[PDB]
Write a protein that binds this ligand. Structure first.
Ligand SMILES: [Zn+2]
Lengths: 1078, 140, 49
């Protein structure tokens, strides 16, 4: 056995796995519970594991937060473009007989580019399957910009320039969402290489370890030859390699956190650091867990969770009420007047409450009490039907107290007396009596009005009451008084009911006014740790339409103090008064007064324990059950009889507090009552109230200590916490992202304005929101609902809020202010980074100029000379608006086109076209202009803002013409799609070469070639072509000597060599030892 | 150790101590088994209501039916499901024919779009038909 | 609007949506027209969905 949790192990050699849960490093479970009084351990596994060998299931669709990563955390690799091999002076290092080949940290090629392959070199236990992968710039990558809403276009190999911003935002969302991993503490290894003498190095789990050193350690190779790589290596420091420092909290012989030097990138290291901080700040203690459980058990059960002291333990289960309430609002909106959604919850809670409750109902009590062998003593017994054993209505009514604001429980229409009714008929009187005892248990905001008006209806023709108008007579069915705006003045003020005219009805109104049950409240839950999902109420109370009392089973059964028994006695005495003098039963040929009074007394006094159960024990069971429910209670205050404070409507608002927009009431306000109405059969409720007994040996301590254990060993609160954390994160990310593409009033700072886009409408915003939602769902690996109800009805929202209104126009707006979200913050950071290094993702800022450049010079089109380009300030240019009207020229006259100022100009000079002009009519233009661009003088600048690009390297010593590519692009730019702009760039050469003419047409306006890593990496220098050394500023901590190892210039330029923090936590399952209270 | 993925993603010397005993002696009154079965029934999470939300291409998901008609139909379906769960031919608790005039109830369906317009022609076809008018072809 | 086809209707309904490449009379009229009067400009939304 184990001397920590008193658990019995069959094989003593397997005790190590058990004590690993308690936290002892001796030498798949989610919850492990132990019972003190009995030998029956209960364990949990996820819903999809195996043959389920005597194990419970966790039915929550939990997300996966804790995910590890054993590998370098870079996201930008370095790829060659045009490979080239050169002669070398030094071939390999030699040590005695053996020799070792030289390995280079960078690809030895003529040119090199930096692309984005997130997690390209990463060993992960659980991949989120999201990826932003860029092909080398020679190949085209348009599938990543035609992702979201290019469902139908006019060209398959194109992307819509009007909708680049949404695609770029979703790409950034994927890039930040698939880098949410925690680094791990894989083992190290020394190194006595004459270049890294004595420095520790990290080894990766896999086939080879020496393979991954030239990568992640550029300084292991020395300076054997004279090349650009060797020159870069010779400038770095020789002490910032490998391990930096470790911890004193040694685990065995291996530390539990470490700082190392290796290749990485600042964006991903900062993203993972923020994720680490968010996960760490959610930590909770086993002592907190045991306190929560022991104070949630309402004192009937005490728990304990022994553990060993260890800092390196993480378990995120701590949230805030702000995050707890947003998911509650989302779940409230999920229903949308769908009874199919709410039926299973109520049915299952009814079944569970029936299974737990000690009260068992046997209708034989009524039959025994009314010892009969038509008579009133037999009509009532034939009407209550004491043979049917289906009493689900009572338990459903009990379960409906937790969802006042969602669902309203009312008495079914059939239960009321037929066609009005008359006090004249015995059958009718009994229907009224049955309805009167079952009405108070309903959640209908106006029960007493129906209770008074049913007797008022039955009593018509014998006695009368005044009315307010000649539209509503006394004979009005009580089923129509379902709204507080119809309460009669006679009911609200007794003095207008004259005792001379209506004595019995005045007494009925008096009894309703005084002895109607009044509401109360009870504490529950653990606000310290579990939070509170209750709205419109203080965060630690359940509201009940019944005054609760301390629970003891020795109370007298005919205690005329509890409201239910007092109500039964009052109703029976009123019926006695009604039937006493036979002023309302003409035609009764017998004197049934004696039998009626006997039956009424025999039913007034009875040994039914149901009122005592409802008064004392039922609130305890409700408070125990409530915190563990999948749907936390959503409750609206009960007002006993105050017509002033009767709630009528509950709605959810999407727009902000200070906005004047379309009034869009939520679908929850369309209900006539405060919630979705359901009907109950009053006969079952009356039978349940009149018949009920405790077991002949009830020890409540034992009963509840035994009952709570199975329902607490199978809990899902610890998973709903991650669920609503993810829900809040998704809500904030959605609102920010939709606000950056629509002109909502949310105050986010915008960084992607230069990328062309359009005013997103309701449909476009809904599609973008759907894509964001499904991307988040895929990344966090869940299949249930989240953020989906927000998709319906114009999801151009600002903040979530819920409110309800009283009868007198008074409202109560609940706006849970929410904290920051790491996902949105990291999205903002990566947007900042993209704003400066857009060129790494294949996006070129600026615009292009089309014109003939026939020269033998060698420069990149991305970096052009100044004199070739022109802007709006250049003299002689012609800016064109939309209204460009091409006019032919007859009799040898040159054709003319319309300037924005109204003047006409020939097809010659320097022009400035918006992209929309060519996109609108791309077929008329290239027919008229292509002849004047190939062998003419026309030069056009097409302002585009942001555009994808692909490169075509050509040998600079041979003739080359780009007219074919330019014409292909011009003919392929149809409306609603543009192919990537084709560029023709020369190839760098380390040796002097000859020169050949080259005709170029497409040149960028501004600098776009900042993704070029180096040219001729394995040569002493570059003579002909674009020159570019190794970027020093990116390897700042190696070159700059007086730089602390932590500082990073992240907003300006990413630096791909940093210090990363690696560590290995462990997550033990929730363990608890349940003990019974004497 | 690789944790398998739940849903498809984008790509797709020694002596026995005198106290220990291995024989049960107590049978719980509220049965362990009975409670567990009900609990796992209550433990089943909320049902997703995906009606009305847009799809990947933008077409709203659902069936073309009037809003109040859909609400009444699903209320009837809920009543039938309640009867089936109660395993009786007639259900005591009914979410339908309540007796409260609820003729203004609305429940989401596929009839309406996010732009407040009918879905007689699915949206993708509407956008395709709009763009078509603009297209021009190579000169004869 | 419903029917077997609507491509012709998308051109007939909105005169000021056609492009203006020529110097024809129709093109001149479309260019002289005002750009920001097309389709819906006001609505009365009361309930989401
Ligand atoms: Zn143990």
């Amino acid at each position: 056995q184990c001397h920590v949790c008193s658990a019995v192990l069959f094989s003593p050699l397997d005790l190590d796995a058990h004590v690993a849960s308690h936290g002892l490093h001796g030498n798949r479970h989610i919850t492990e519970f132990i019972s003190s009084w009995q030998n029956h351990p209960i364990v949990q596994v996820s819903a999809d594991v195996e043959n389920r060998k005597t194990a419970q299931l966790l039915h929550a669709d939990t997300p996966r937060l804790v995910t590890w990563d054993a590998g370098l955390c870079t996201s930008f690799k370095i790829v060659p473009i045009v490979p080239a091999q050169v002669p070398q002076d030094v071939l390999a290092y030699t040590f005695f007989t053996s020799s070792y080949a030289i390995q280079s940290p960078f690809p030895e090629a003529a040119v090199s580019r930096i692309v984005v392959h997130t997690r390209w070199a990463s060993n992960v236990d659980f991949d989120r399957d999201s990826s932003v992968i860029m092909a080398p710039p020679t190949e085209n990558n348009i599938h990543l910009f035609k992702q979201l809403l290019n469902t139908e276009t006019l060209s398959v190999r194109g992307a819509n320039p009007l909708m680049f911003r949404a695609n770029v935002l979703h790409m950034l969302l994927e890039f930040v969402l698939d880098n949410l991993y925690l680094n791990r503490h894989t083992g190290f290894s020394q190194d006595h290489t004459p270049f890294t003498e004595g420095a520790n190095l990290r080894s990766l789990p896999g086939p080879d370890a020496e393979k991954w050193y030239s990568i992640m350690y550029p300084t292991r190779m020395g300076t054997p030859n004279v090349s650009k790589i060797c020159n870069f290596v010779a400038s770095c420091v020789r002490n910032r390699v490998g391990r930096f420092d470790r911890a004193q909290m040694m685990n065995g012989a291996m530390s539990e956190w470490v700082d190392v030097f290796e290749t990485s990138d600042a964006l991903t290291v900062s993203i993972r650091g923020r994720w680490m901080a968010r996960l760490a700040r959610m930590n909770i203690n086993p002592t907190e867990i045991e306190w929560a459980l022991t104070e949630c058990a309402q004192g009937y059960v005490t728990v304990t969770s022994p553990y060993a002291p260890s800092v390196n333990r993480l378990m995120p289960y701590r949230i805030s009420n702000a995050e707890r309430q947003i998911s509650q609002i989302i779940r409230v909106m999920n229903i949308g007047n769908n009874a199919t959604v709410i039926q299973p919850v109520l049915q299952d809670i009814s079944v569970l409450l029936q299974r737990i409750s000690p009260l068992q109902i046997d209708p034989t009590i009524i039959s025994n009490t009314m010892s009969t062998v038509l008579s009133p003593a037999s009509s009532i017994l034939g009407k209550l039907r004491p043979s049917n054993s289906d009493f689900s209505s009572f338990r459903v009514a009990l379960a409906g107290w937790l969802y006042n604001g969602v669902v309203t429980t009312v008495i079914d229409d059939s239960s009321y007396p037929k066609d009005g009714g008359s006090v004249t008929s015995l059958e009718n009187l009994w229907d009224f009596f049955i309805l009167a005892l079952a009405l108070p248990l309903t959640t209908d905001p106006c029960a007493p009005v129906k209770a008074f008006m049913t007797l008022a209806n039955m009593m018509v023709g014998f006695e009368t009451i005044p009315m307010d108008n000649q539209i509503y007579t006394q004979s009005r069915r009580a089923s129509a008084f379902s709204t507080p705006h119809t309460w009669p003045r006679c009911f609200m003020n007794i003095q207008l009911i004259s005792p001379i005219d209506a004595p019995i009805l005045r007494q009925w109104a008096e009894i309703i006014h005084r002895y109607w049950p009044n509401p109360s409240q009870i504490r529950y839950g653990t606000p310290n740790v579990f939070g509170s999902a209750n709205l419109f109420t203080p965060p630690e109370v359940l509201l009940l339409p019944i005054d609760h009392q301390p629970a003891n089973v020795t109370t007298p059964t005919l205690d005329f103090t509890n409201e239910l028994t007092n109500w039964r006695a009052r109703v029976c005495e009123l019926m006695k008064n009604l039937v006493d003098n036979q002023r309302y039963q003409p035609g009764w040929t017998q004197s049934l007064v004696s039998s009626m009074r006997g039956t009424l007394g025999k039913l007034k006094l009875i040994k039914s324990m149901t009122p005592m159960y409802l008064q004392q024990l039922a609130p305890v069971e409700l408070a125990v059950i409530a915190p563990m429910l999948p749907f936390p209670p959503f409750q609206v205050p009960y007002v006993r009889l105050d017509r002033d404070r009767v709630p009528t409507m509950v709605g959810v608002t999407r727009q902000s507090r200070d906005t004047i927009t379309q009034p869009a009431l939520s679908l929850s306000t369309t209900n006539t009552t405060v919630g979705v109405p359901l009907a109950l059969d009053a006969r079952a409720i009356t039978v349940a109230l009149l018949s009920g007994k405790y077991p002949p040996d009830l020890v409540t301590n034992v009963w509840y200590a035994d009952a709570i254990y199975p329902m607490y060993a199978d809990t899902e609160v610890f998973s709903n916490l991650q669920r609503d954390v993810i829900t809040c994160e998704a809500v904030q990310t959605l609102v920010t992202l939709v606000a950056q593409i629509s002109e909502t009033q949310y105050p986010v700072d915008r960084y992607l304005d230069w990328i062309p886009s359009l005013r997103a409408s309701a449909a476009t915003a809904a599609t973008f929101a759907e894509w964001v939602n499904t991307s988040m769902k895929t990344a966090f690996d869940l299949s249930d609902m989240l953020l989906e109800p927000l998709l319906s009805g114009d999801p151009r929202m600002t903040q979530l809020a819920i409110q309800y209104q009283q009868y007198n126009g008074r409202t109560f707006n609940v706006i849970p202010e929410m904290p920051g979200s790491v996902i949105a913050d990291c999205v903002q950071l990566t947007a900042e980074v993209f704003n400066h290094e857009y060129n790494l993702f294949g996006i070129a800022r600026g615009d292009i100029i089309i014109g003939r450049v026939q020269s033998t010079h060698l420069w990149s089109p991305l970096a052009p000379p100044p004199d070739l380009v022109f802007d709006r300030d250049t003299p002689g240019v012609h800016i064109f608006g939309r209204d460009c009207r091409i006019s032919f020229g007859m009799n040898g006259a040159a054709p003319m086109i319309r300037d924005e100022t109204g003047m006409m100009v020939p097809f010659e000079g320097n022009w400035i076209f918006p992209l929309a002009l060519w996109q609108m009519n791309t077929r008329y233009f290239n027919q008229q202009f292509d002849a004047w661009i190939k062998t003419g003088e026309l030069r056009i600048r097409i302002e585009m803002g942001a555009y994808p690009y692909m490169l075509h390297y050509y040998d600079p010593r041979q003739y080359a013409n780009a007219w074919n590519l330019t014409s292909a692009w011009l003919e392929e730019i149809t409306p609603t799609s543009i192919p990537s702009v084709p560029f023709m760039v020369p190839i760098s050469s380390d040796h002097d070469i000859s020169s050949a003419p080259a005709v170029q047409y497409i040149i960028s306006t501004e600098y776009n070639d900042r993704s070029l890593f180096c040219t001729n990496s394995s040569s002493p220098q570059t003579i002909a072509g674009p020159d570019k050394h190794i970027p020093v500023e990116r390897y700042n901590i190696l070159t700059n000597p007086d730089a602390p190892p932590t500082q990073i210039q992240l907003p300006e330029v990413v630096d791909l060599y940093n210090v990363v923090t690696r560590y290995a936590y462990e997550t033990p399952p929730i363990t608890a030892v349940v003990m019974g209270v004497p | 150790k690789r944790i398998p993925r739940k849903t498809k993603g984008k790509s797709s010397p020694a002596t026995a101590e005198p106290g220990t005993s291995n024989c049960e002696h107590y049978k719980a009154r509220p049965g362990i088994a009975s409670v567990q079965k009900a609990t796992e029934s209550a433990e089943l999470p909320m049902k997703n209501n995906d009606e009305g939300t847009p799809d990947k291409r933008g077409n709203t998901k659902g069936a073309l039916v009037n809003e109040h008609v859909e609400a009444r139909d699903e209320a009837d379906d809920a009543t039938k499901k309640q009867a089936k769960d109660t395993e009786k031919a007639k259900a005591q608790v009914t979410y339908s024919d309540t007796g409260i005039n609820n003729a203004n109830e609305l429940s989401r369906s596929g009839n309406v779009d996010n732009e407040g317009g009918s879905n007689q022609k699915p949206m993708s076809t509407r956008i395709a038909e709009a763009t078509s008018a603009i297209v021009s072809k190579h000169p004869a």
